[PDB]
């Protein structure tokens, strides 16, 4: 991986450059504008409906880092139902439309 000697990022300075949408292949893509302490492991987590304890974010980009000239694109596969994809304090209401 890249970014194992870094830290988890800020919770605040993530803003949506890009709207989380479905890929047409049951994954959710996005892009953040992190203008803070770079680079760092993005706190990507996505809970489900029925249990807000457990993170169920089956990631496709592992270990996302916002580099000094790079980083942003995150893709994840999710189980069906209501899903709150957190990127720090910034979150996103999502329903996985597949069964």
């Amino acid at each position: 991986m890249k970014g194992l000697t870094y830290t988890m990022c800020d919770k605040t300075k993530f803003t949506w450059k890009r709207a989380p949408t479905d890929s047409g292949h049951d994954t959710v893509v996005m892009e953040v504008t992190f203008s803070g302490t770079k680079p760092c492991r993005i706190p990507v987590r996505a809970v489900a409906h029925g249990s807000p304890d457990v993170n169920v974010a089956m990631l496709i980009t592992p270990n996302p880092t916002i580099e000094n000239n790079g980083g942003g694109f995150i893709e994840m596969q999710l189980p069906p139902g209501d899903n709150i994809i957190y990127v720090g304090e910034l979150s996103y209401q999502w329903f996985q439309k597949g069964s």
């Epitope: 870094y6 800020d10 919770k11 605040t12 803070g36 302490t37």
Partner: antibody, heavy 120, light 108 residues
Framework: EVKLEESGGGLVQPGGSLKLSCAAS????????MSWVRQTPDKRLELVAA????????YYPDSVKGRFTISRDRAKNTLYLQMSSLKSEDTAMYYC?????????????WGQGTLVTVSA | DIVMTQSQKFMSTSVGDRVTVTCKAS??????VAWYQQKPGQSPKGLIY???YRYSGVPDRFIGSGSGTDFTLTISNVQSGDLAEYFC?????????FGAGTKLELKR
């Protein structure tokens, strides 16, 4: 009145160990983050351990990477720094910090600061 | 690491004058701007972040600018409580490196 009372200022030989604390007041804990910043006696500042809210993870520069242990407590209002294997150039004014709601890298309010002289 | 070199090491000013402090950067860091104000024995003050914002407790005497490599901390109405040490800082890179310190002085 936001207060950051530093403590744990002693006189330990190099290759030793300290444990700093910081009595915090005037702000809720987990909505913000806490960190340590040192100042050398010849007026050259240096980061010790910057870290985010909620005690997620710990950063260290390569000068002190893998030796110290920064930890925290929410309700008790205490920022810890479990140090070990003291370098002789660790004689510096250790400052308890207070980052903003936005975690801006910089620190809005501060403390009076102590001196941990690492002398041979 | 990204160095933050202050051009103003030991500068002086009067009471009523408006002066400013600049600070270098090894590369384009943009709006990762941070300054301070510490007196000897007392605490620093995280006045301006991102070159245009303030915290509650900072007056209109402290403005700022500079997005890129060179920053700008313009201070109008230099009081007796501005006799202090002004630090520079980038919070782009890890580690968030610092300026050595601009000792603002009184003209005599």
């Amino acid at each position: 009145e936001v207060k950051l009372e530093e403590s744990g200022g002693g006189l330990v030989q190099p290759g030793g160990s300290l444990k700093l604390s910081c009595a915090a007041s005037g702000f809720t804990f987990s909505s913000y983050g806490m960190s340590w910043v040192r100042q050398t006696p010849d007026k050259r500042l240096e980061l010790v351990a910057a870290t985010n809210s909620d005690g997620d993870s710990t950063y260290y520069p390569d000068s002190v990477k893998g030796r110290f242990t920064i930890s925290r407590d929410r309700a008790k209002n205490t920022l810890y720094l479990q140090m070990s294997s003291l370098k002789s150039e660790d004689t510096a004014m250790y400052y308890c910090t207070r980052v903003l709601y936005d975690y801006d890298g910089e620190f809005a309010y501060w403390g009076q600061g102590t001196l941990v002289t690492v002398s041979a | 690491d990204i160095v933050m070199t202050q051009s103003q090491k030991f500068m002086s000013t009067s009471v009523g004058d408006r002066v400013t402090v600049t600070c270098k950067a090894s590369q384009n860091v943009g709006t990762n701007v941070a300054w301070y104000q510490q007196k000897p024995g007392q605490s620093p003050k995280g006045l301006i972040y991102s070159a245009s914002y303030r915290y509650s407790g900072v007056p209109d005497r402290f403005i700022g600018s500079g997005s890129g490599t060179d920053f700008t901390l313009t201070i109008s109405n230099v009081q007796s409580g501005d006799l202090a040490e002004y630090f520079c800082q980038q919070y782009n890179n890890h580690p968030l490196t610092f300026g050595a310190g601009t000792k603002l002085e009184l003209k005599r």
